[PDB]
Design a protein around this motif. Structure first.
Motif, PDB file in Angstrom:
ATOM      1  N   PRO A 114       0.807  -1.230   0.000  1.00 32.71           N
ATOM      2  CA  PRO A 114       0.000   0.000   0.000  1.00 32.71           C
ATOM      3  C   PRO A 114       0.831   1.267   0.000  1.00 32.71           C
ATOM      4  CG  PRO A 114      -0.978  -1.613   1.420  1.00 32.71           C
ATOM      5  CD  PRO A 114       0.379  -2.150   1.059  1.00 32.71           C
ATOM      6  N   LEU A 115       1.998   1.254   0.641  1.00 37.44           N
ATOM      7  CA  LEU A 115       2.857   2.426   0.604  1.00 37.44           C
ATOM      8  C   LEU A 115       3.460   2.604  -0.781  1.00 37.44           C
ATOM      9  CD1 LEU A 115       4.683   2.145   4.065  1.00 37.44           C
ATOM     10  CD2 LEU A 115       3.271   4.039   3.314  1.00 37.44           C
ATOM     11  N   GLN A 170       0.641   4.148  -3.025  1.00 38.01           N
ATOM     12  CA  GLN A 170       0.349   5.556  -2.815  1.00 38.01           C
ATOM     13  C   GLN A 170       1.486   6.441  -3.324  1.00 38.01           C
ATOM     14  OE1 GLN A 170      -2.711   7.357  -1.315  1.00 38.01           O
ATOM     15  NE2 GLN A 170      -1.510   8.332  -2.942  1.00 38.01           N
ATOM     16  N   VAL A 209       1.468   3.868   7.778  1.00 41.59           N
ATOM     17  CA  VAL A 209       0.138   4.084   7.217  1.00 41.59           C
ATOM     18  C   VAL A 209      -0.745   4.806   8.224  1.00 41.59           C
ATOM     19  CG1 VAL A 209      -1.972   2.915   6.510  1.00 41.59           C
ATOM     20  CG2 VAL A 209       0.234   2.156   5.577  1.00 41.59           C
ATOM     21  N   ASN A 213      -4.574  17.373   8.483  1.00 40.63           N
ATOM     22  CA  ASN A 213      -5.799  18.162   8.546  1.00 40.63           C
ATOM     23  C   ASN A 213      -6.783  17.541   9.530  1.00 40.63           C
ATOM     24  OD1 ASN A 213      -4.455  19.366   6.297  1.00 40.63           O
ATOM     25  ND2 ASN A 213      -6.434  20.056   5.498  1.00 40.63           N
TER      26      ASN A 213
HETATM   27  O1  LIG Z   1      -3.763  16.962   5.947  1.00 41.47           O
HETATM   28  C1  LIG Z   1      -3.776  16.771   4.745  1.00 41.47           C
HETATM   29  N1  LIG Z   1      -3.994  17.769   3.797  1.00 41.47           N
HETATM   30  C2  LIG Z   1      -3.450  17.633   2.516  1.00 41.47           C
HETATM   31  C3  LIG Z   1      -3.277  18.797   1.756  1.00 41.47           C
HETATM   32  C4  LIG Z   1      -2.734  18.689   0.489  1.00 41.47           C
HETATM   33  C5  LIG Z   1      -2.374  17.438  -0.001  1.00 41.47           C
HETATM   34  C6  LIG Z   1      -2.551  16.294   0.762  1.00 41.47           C
HETATM   35  C7  LIG Z   1      -3.094  16.355   2.048  1.00 41.47           C
HETATM   36  C8  LIG Z   1      -3.305  15.140   2.942  1.00 41.47           C
HETATM   37  C9  LIG Z   1      -4.618  14.415   2.653  1.00 41.47           C
HETATM   38  C10 LIG Z   1      -4.655  12.921   2.956  1.00 41.47           C
HETATM   39  N2  LIG Z   1      -3.406  12.224   2.527  1.00 41.47           N
HETATM   40  C11 LIG Z   1      -3.501  10.767   2.760  1.00 41.47           C
HETATM   41  C12 LIG Z   1      -3.013  10.106   1.488  1.00 41.47           C
HETATM   42  C13 LIG Z   1      -2.464   8.784   1.850  1.00 41.47           C
HETATM   43  C14 LIG Z   1      -1.140   8.657   2.267  1.00 41.47           C
HETATM   44  C15 LIG Z   1      -0.648   7.405   2.593  1.00 41.47           C
HETATM   45  C16 LIG Z   1      -1.491   6.302   2.490  1.00 41.47           C
HETATM   46  C17 LIG Z   1      -0.947   4.968   2.839  1.00 41.47           C
HETATM   47  F1  LIG Z   1      -0.024   4.526   1.972  1.00 41.47           F
HETATM   48  F2  LIG Z   1      -0.377   4.942   4.042  1.00 41.47           F
HETATM   49  F3  LIG Z   1      -1.882   3.991   2.846  1.00 41.47           F
HETATM   50  C18 LIG Z   1      -2.805   6.419   2.076  1.00 41.47           C
HETATM   51  C19 LIG Z   1      -3.290   7.671   1.753  1.00 41.47           C
HETATM   52  C20 LIG Z   1      -2.235  12.763   3.249  1.00 41.47           C
HETATM   53  C21 LIG Z   1      -2.048  14.249   3.054  1.00 41.47           C
HETATM   54  O2  LIG Z   1      -3.551  15.508   4.322  1.00 41.47           O
END
Ligand SMILES: O=C1Nc2ccccc2C2(CCN(CCc3ccc(C(F)(F)F)cc3)CC2)O1
Ligand SMILES: O=C1Nc2ccccc2C2(CCN(CCc3ccc(C(F)(F)F)cc3)CC2)O1
Lengths: 306, 306
Positions: A252-253, A256, A297, B142
């Motif tokens: 999953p990492l 993403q 995660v 956030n």
């Molecule tokens: O605070 C905030 N505002 C924000 C503002 C601009 C861009 C991104 C964001 C995020 C929104 C959620 N985004 C989660 C995405 C994500 C990351 C890792 C995984 C995983 F690999 F671990 F599974 C899954 C999803 C992290 C950053 O967050």
């Protein structure tokens, strides 16, 4: 948005800590429902600890010899038994603060929070990993025995560690909550040495993924590798072999970030061969190996608990 | 016996966290007695955040527009006011879990624990320092706004930080609990850059004392220095100047180890000039500056809390 060594909130476990005294020895116990769990070496003197016969020492102890105190209030002991290296003291009152819980025996590489306590009172909380040599690198002084390690998944506390021993080298050894030591260690004051403290490769890779998500990417290179080629370099640097199970867990990492697991392995390989050249990754000059893929995660997503 | 980055037990603060919603914005609040404290930018849309007029935006909000939820149970808002950058929402119910507490405004270099929360629910706990440039290096996504930082002395929680902003550089800015930002930062989405992140010299020295107490002493040398001579090297390496007040605070660690403060300064000076040569100190390849002298004493002694 930042990435920190982070412990679970400790309140659910704080409400379970008590003080246990036997003779002149005081340490901590864990009160869940109507049972208090503690290290069996509470019954030893410092004399006894060189070669204890725990069964024999227990013949001389009755329920009323185990003093259990929850905050300011005394608990009434109505039974006691020994299970492996822990004592179970039955008390007449169920802990009203008992959380949902499980006892889990973890594997090397897995992480958990420790609530360090003295005399039944919480001192602090920090995050630890079960090392591949089955020690942990904690912060434990005399009287901290019986402090526990745990993980939380929403409302349920999984207790995985109870603290018993400091080895002559300053690392720590303990049991699960059924009283079985992790690794080969025993609750005697004798010559027991830890084996090689190897680095938890899958955790380092997870942490490199965390760095990329958080803006630290100078270490990404133009290379890739294979499991077998990477593992030749891991062995040279006393890193755990990486398996396909590990690759799958990083899936999953990988998805993403868009960085293939074996590409990140090639970045790690160059870091091991060339060093950091004075740079840092997420505020460290070492490669951190006490974040699991699930930890990364969780923190990078904001998962919470009751 | 080991030395770990260690947070305060978080239970007393967990019982104070609630969710606050205004319009489409949800973040965290702190419920103490019959008041809920939260960042005033809860009233903003993401539009509003570029140039908010908070007084004007507040004209359009009534008590019933602030949705406060403690776990599963809704709290009744009977008054609201703005104090600097925080809102204070008066509710009709005193928090039954209110600990003894104080509001304290800390100085740069001082450390505290953060209970990171999302939607009023605890996610994790970690230790932070107020940097000399009045940012903190946290882990905030956030919805984590309104998470708080705190210290505990036995039974009394001193709240020192509430989280408000992430700067474009990924570091964090926030207020004390009277709503005044640390440093020059404002609760607007604009160009605000952090100044120099210098190293907290007195904390590094405290941590070197901790290392000696715990067996890591390869860095002790045959030299000494003076405050003025050391400070010439500190400036070169963007270290805070060391004062006689700092020397005095290190006095108890000096006495217990028998290493004069200025002798330890000479060890630090050689570390800065020569680097670590690939070695580690207490498991770090960097000089750690987020332990205060009081933190070191506390952890090396086993002081506890209610
Ligand atoms: O605070 C905030 N505002 C924000 C503002 C601009 C861009 C991104 C964001 C995020 C929104 C959620 N985004 C989660 C995405 C994500 C990351 C890792 C995984 C995983 F690999 F671990 F599974 C899954 C999803 C992290 C950053 O967050
Ligand atoms: O667990 C144990 N067994 C043990 C076993 C052998 C030697 C020493 C110990 C100690 C006993 C208390 N000893 C505290 C001494 C101390 C250290 C620092 C300060 C201070 F500078 F921070 F103030 C004050 C006192 C720490 C190690 O602990």
């Amino acid at each position: 948005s930042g990435f920190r060594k982070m412990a679970f909130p400790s309140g659910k476990v704080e409400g379970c800590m008590v003080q246990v005294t036997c003779g002149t020895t005081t340490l901590n116990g864990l009160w869940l429902d109507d049972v208090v769990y503690c290290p069996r070496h509470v019954i030893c003197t410092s004399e006894d600890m060189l070669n204890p016969n725990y069964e024999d020492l227990l013949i001389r102890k009755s329920n009323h010899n185990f003093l259990v105190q929850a905050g300011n209030v005394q608990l009434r002991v109505i039974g006691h038994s020994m299970q492996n290296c822990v004592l179970k003291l039955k008390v007449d009152t169920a802990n009203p603060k008992t959380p949902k819980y499980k006892f889990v025996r973890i594997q090397p590489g897995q992480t958990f929070s420790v609530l360090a306590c003295y005399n039944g009172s919480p001192s602090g909380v920090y995050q630890c990993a079960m090392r591949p040599n089955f020690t942990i690198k904690g912060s434990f002084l005399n009287g901290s025995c019986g402090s526990v390690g745990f993980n939380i998944d929403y409302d349920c506390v999984s207790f995985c560690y109870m603290h018993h021993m400091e080895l002559p080298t300053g690392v720590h050894a303990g049991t699960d909550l059924e009283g079985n030591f992790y690794g080969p260690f025993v609750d005697r004051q004798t010559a027991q040495a830890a084996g090689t403290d190897t680095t938890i490769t899958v955790n380092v890779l997870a942490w490199l993924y965390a760095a990329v998500i958080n803006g630290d990417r100078w270490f990404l290179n133009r290379f890739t590798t294979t499991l077998n080629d990477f593992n030749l370099v891991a062995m040279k640097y006393n890193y755990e072999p990486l398996t396909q199970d590990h690759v799958d867990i990083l899936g999953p990492l990988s998805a993403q970030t868009g960085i293939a697991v074996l590409d990140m392995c090639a970045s790690l390989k160059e870091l091991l061969q060339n060093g950091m050249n004075g740079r840092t990754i997420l505020g460290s000059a070492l490669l951190e190996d006490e974040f699991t893929p699930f930890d990364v995660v969780r923190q990078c997503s904001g998962v919470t608990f009751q």
